[PDB]
Amino acid sequence: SSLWQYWRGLSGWNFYFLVKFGLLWAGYLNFHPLLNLVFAAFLLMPLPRYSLHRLRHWIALPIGFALFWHDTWLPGPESIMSQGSQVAGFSTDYLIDLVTRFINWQMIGAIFVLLVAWLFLSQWIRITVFVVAILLWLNVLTLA
Amino acid sequence: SSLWQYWRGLSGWNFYFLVKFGLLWAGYLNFHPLLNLVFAAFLLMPLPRYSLHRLRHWIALPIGFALFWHDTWLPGPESIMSQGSQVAGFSTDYLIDLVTRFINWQMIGAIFVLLVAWLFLSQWIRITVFVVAILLWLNVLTLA
Amino acid sequence: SSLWQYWRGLSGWNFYFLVKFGLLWAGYLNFHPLLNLVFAAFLLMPLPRYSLHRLRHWIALPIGFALFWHDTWLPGPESIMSQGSQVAGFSTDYLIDLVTRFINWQMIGAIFVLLVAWLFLSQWIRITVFVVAILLWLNVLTLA
Amino acid sequence: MSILTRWLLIPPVNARLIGRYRDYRRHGASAFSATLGCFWMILAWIFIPLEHPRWQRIRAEHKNLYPHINASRPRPLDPVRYLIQTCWLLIGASAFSGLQNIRGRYHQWMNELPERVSHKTQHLDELGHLSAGARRLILGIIVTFSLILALICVTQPFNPLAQFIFLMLLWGVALIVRRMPGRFSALMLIVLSLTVSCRYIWWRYTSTLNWDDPVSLVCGLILLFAETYAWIVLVLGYFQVVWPLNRQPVPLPKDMSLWPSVDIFVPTYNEDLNVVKNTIYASLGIDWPKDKLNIWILDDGGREEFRQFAQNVGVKYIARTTHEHAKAGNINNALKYAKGEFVSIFDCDHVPTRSFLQMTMGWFLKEKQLAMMQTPHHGLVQDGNDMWDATFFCGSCAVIRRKPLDEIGGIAVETVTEDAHTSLRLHRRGYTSAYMRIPQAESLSAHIGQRIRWARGMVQIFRLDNPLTGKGLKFAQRLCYVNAMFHFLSGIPRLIFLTAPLAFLLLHAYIIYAPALMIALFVLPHMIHASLTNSKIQGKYRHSFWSEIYETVLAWYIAPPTLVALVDWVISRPYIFLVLLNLVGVAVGIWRYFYGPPTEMLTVVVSMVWVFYNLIVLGGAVAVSVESKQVRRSHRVEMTMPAAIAREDGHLFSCTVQDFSDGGLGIKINGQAQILEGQKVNLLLKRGQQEYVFPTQVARVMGNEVGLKLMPLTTQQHIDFVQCTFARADLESLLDILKLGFRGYRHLAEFAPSSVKGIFRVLTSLVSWVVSFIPRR
Amino acid sequence: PWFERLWYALANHPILLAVLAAISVILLAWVLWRLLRIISRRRLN
């Protein structure tokens, strides 16, 4: 049958994975290739109904956010719940200074440039094929 | 009447067989060529009746489950049948702990990935030919 | 439309970057490849409405001027209004003499030659692709 | 096999693949090509998102975006073509009113600049206002200053960068100057071209001849002599057409009784009465006093139809008993009987206009020494010649004063070109000739024949009545005639130009001892400026080195008629011999490019281009040789003129005449007219403010295109018809020349001897194969 | 070296030589145009 009509690809999530690739080359990410392959497989799986596809994406957005959190070296949420008393005690200016020290504007600019490049290249190159190929290669290397 | 018209392939069983191959390549399962090939032939037998088809599926599903259980290293069905009283009498928390320890989440992730891969490849290449070829090649290797 | 013909190109800004490339060959530039790539992406961002397109270009003009200020070895603002008092204290004749000494008319002639070449090429050949390729080349060289 | 895909693939995808394969097979593709095509297509689908709306829009206009790739017919290496064309699309280029208006207004202002400058110089009319000694001194210092500056710019040594800057600046100056019209612009461009050519020649003589290896020395000397001869010819041509006279007619006295007697001559030998009827009718229609014009037909065949036609219409008819000296002898024999003070001579095909003699003979009644006056056959060379009193007879459409013509003993008969020799003889006695570029009115085989006879006639004119050693000629006329003779001799320089790149590539000599870039920085300015200045002087709409290639290939073709004077050859051995040398030179050059030292590598590349040029030029000469004998169409001039048609019903249909001939007219009628064949209709033709009605019968109707035929007309009707119809008051080129050379080589492979037929066929095959990958818009 | 002196002086200035050549072209064109107008008047009449 025409099951290809239900294989819509990752679409915007491509940029998502592409971002991670950069943070992999930049060393900012603790990569879990199997979880990335699981997420790609779940977002690629064909759901016959359009509403089901939309609901899957809406459910997967929090899951993708949690996976991205797990892929970085940032402190876990429980640490934030424990130290919220210390966080709130600091002044607003202190928090502004700390975050400005944290925000690496080069990575923000790289994100912007990569977003533009992805929007231009989605016309000519199948980004989903390449993203899945890179994920498979990374899993192969991390296994053998 | 006509027989060859009923050779639709293993269909769903194909995935199951590939699953076993994964557990065969991961070394966590002890593959039996004889019983597996017998099950494949039993599901592949062209039965003219649709009622016979559904009845064979109904008979094979518990038989397939028992075969999968037997291929593992868990205690045999008779032993677990004898010890079911104690197993139900055992604490729920320790049972959950044992279940979690037994379940390697890497295997579940790989199985989900292989499910998606099988669903994708079930639209371009007939998986039946390759699955039966791998089974026959494994038998030939075991013979030598 | 849906196929996003809103990738209108850099047009005049092309020459802009060309000039910088020439000034990169002349060594008068403290070049910032990342900011140039971000600026090129911002100018190349596909915007459907023409009013927002004009608004984007109009805000980009002072941003481009400030970027050219930053990429040159000419001094930052603080020095500019620190020496503005001395410039005001100097005679008009001294200002004219300093102006006549400051301009290297050879580079002005070269810039005019580049302008004529850019007009002819834009008549014949899309230079936006070449400019973008050279920008990624500079970024790749700087990164590695 | 279908079984393999059937077992391997699911039936839907198997069916789609089989459908694609069969679709490729039916369109003439082989099985291997078809399979490769399906492989490439599935790769394209897996990599490139061909389902995206952008790619749908790319696919829908595939034919326009990929003209040389057939979508329905795969062929191996098609992905190479796809990649090349995609790269070209990536590289090539795909408030308008204000910018266009500003630009156009800028050219228009620059174009009207000469008029404003002339007006401003008119109000300060003014050297000219100083004494003779002061004028001489001021002009002398002015000329010496200008010439010393020019000499300094001629003899100035530069490095590559300064040289290139100088060339760019001078090329830009020439480009600006060319746009502005006027004779001052022409003179400025001429001076620029002279300066650049002198610079090039100075550099070649001072820095490029190799004095170490004698073979290279000899080759360089021959090539430099050829370049010097070409430069001399170019300078002489510049001088000939430096200042066209642009003569205007001086009106005749208003009293018609003071007008002279003219005798019109129409000499014919084999032309049909259809051709001569138009000429004689139009001659009778010329505005002139009847008692002051007499028409003569000089038929060498004695056709009785001509006699009856002349007697019916009244024009004089005279035949010859003997036919010595052809047309010149015929005119000389007729001149014993004419009694007018002027003799006009017309070719059979040339139609005389009514306003001919009135516009022409004012100069005759004004200037006493004017023994000749010439009107254009269809240029700018004659206008320049008239400045130097060197306009020569072209055999027709000219008026000669009778007394000077009889003084030299009639038309010269010692040369094939009797016209030019008669002009020479008129000039040698001190008489003047004129030329008016005012309209008064084919097959390229006749063009080549007439060029041949012109060359031979100039050869014999030099042989018998040598202008250089002759008496009675002013210097400018000698320069004009010598320039014509030189231009008819340009075969040896072209042979040297063809052979020299082989003298480098085969013998490994250094005929021109200089770095390749230096070579390009002294030579390309020369041809660029020469072409630009010649384009300005001629004023042609199409003007380029390509156009110049065109006359060089149509002048290399008559190399051996002119050389013998002192179709057949282009296929003979001594020609394909040269082509084969130029061909092996290319392979040897590829060998030098890969296996020779890198230090000389660029030089080899240069010779490549040179040889390529030769390969075009030779390929041109064969091509015309076969296209000369291929034209089949006849006289058909399509011009728009509002005629009227009235039916038998009297319904007035204004129409436009598409084509016309003595047999009838084919016209275009505006609107829907139900005109039936055989219906007697009235055709109203417009002659100025007069309207003349000719009754016609409709013979053919093609929709709005209606053909009408004439019933037997009368003498006055015939004259009116001829007056209203004939005697009216009336990067791409590089590609075209490439096609011309290619078609010449293809014909050479078709018609050469077999031993070289095979080689040329193979060469054409690989040339087409190589061109098959070229990107296209 | 009297003549190598000028070549050394103007060697590095193609702009100046281009301007001088343009001036010489315009000047010589003016004198030639005057002469040719004189000859044209002498021949037309």
Numbering used by the authors:
A (entry chain C), B (entry chain B), C (entry chain D): 12 to 155
D (entry chain A): 1 to 94, 105 to 136, 140 to 391, 417 to 479, 485 to 609, 631 to 794, 809 to 855
E (entry chain E): 26 to 70
Show passages lifted from the paper:
Bacterial cellulosic polymers constitute a prevalent class of biofilm matrix exopolysaccharides that are synthesized by several types of bacterial cellulose secretion (Bcs) systems, which include conserved cyclic diguanylate (c-di-GMP)-dependent cellulose synthase modules together with diverse accessory subunits. In E. coli, the biogenesis of phosphoethanolamine (pEtN)-modified cellulose relies on the BcsRQABEFG macrocomplex, encompassing inner-membrane and cytosolic subunits, and an outer membrane porin, BcsC. Here we present cryo-EM structures of the E. coli Bcs macrocomplex positioning all seven BcsRQABEFG partners and multiple c-di-GMP-binding sites.
We demonstrate that BcsA’s N-terminal domain adopts an amphipathic fold to recruit three copies of the pEtN-transferase BcsG, stabilized opposite of the previously reported hexameric BcsB crown. Indeed, using local refinement to resolve the more dynamically associated pEtN-transferase, we show here that BcsANTD adopts an amphipathic fold and recruits three copies of the BcsG pEtN-transferase whose transmembrane N-terminal domains are tightly packed between BcsATMD and the sixth BcsB protomer of the crown, whereas the C-terminal catalytic BcsG modules remain unresolved in the structures. The BcsA N-terminus folds into a W-shaped series of amphipathic α–helices whose connecting loops coordinate the BcsG protomers via conserved amino acid motifs in an otherwise weakly conserved primary structure. The first and second BcsB copies engage in contacts with the BcsA synthase, where the C-terminal TA of BcsB1 fits in a groove formed by BcsA TMα1–3 and is further encased by BcsANTD to complete the membrane export module, while BcsB2-TA engages in limited hydrophobic contacts with the loop connecting BcsA TMα3 and TMα4 at the periplasmic side of the inner membrane. Interestingly, in BcsG the amphipathic helical loops point outwards relative to the crown’s lumen, where BcsB’s stacked carbohydrate-binding domains are proposed to form the polysaccharide extrusion path. This suggests major conformational gymnastics of the catalytic C-terminal domains for pEtN extraction and transfer onto the nascent cellulosic polymer, and could potentially explain the lack of resolved BcsGCTD-corresponding regions in the averaged electron density maps. The evolution of enterobacterial BcsANTD for the recruitment of multiple BcsG copies per synthase could thus provide efficient substrate mining for extensive polymer modification during processive synthase activity, where individual BcsG protomers are likely to act independently of each other. The membrane sampling and significant conformational changes, which would be required for pEtN-transfer onto a nascent polymer processively extruded through the periplasmic BcsB crown, are possibly enabled by the 48 amino-acid long interdomain linker that could at least theoretically extend more than 10–15 nm in the periplasmic space.
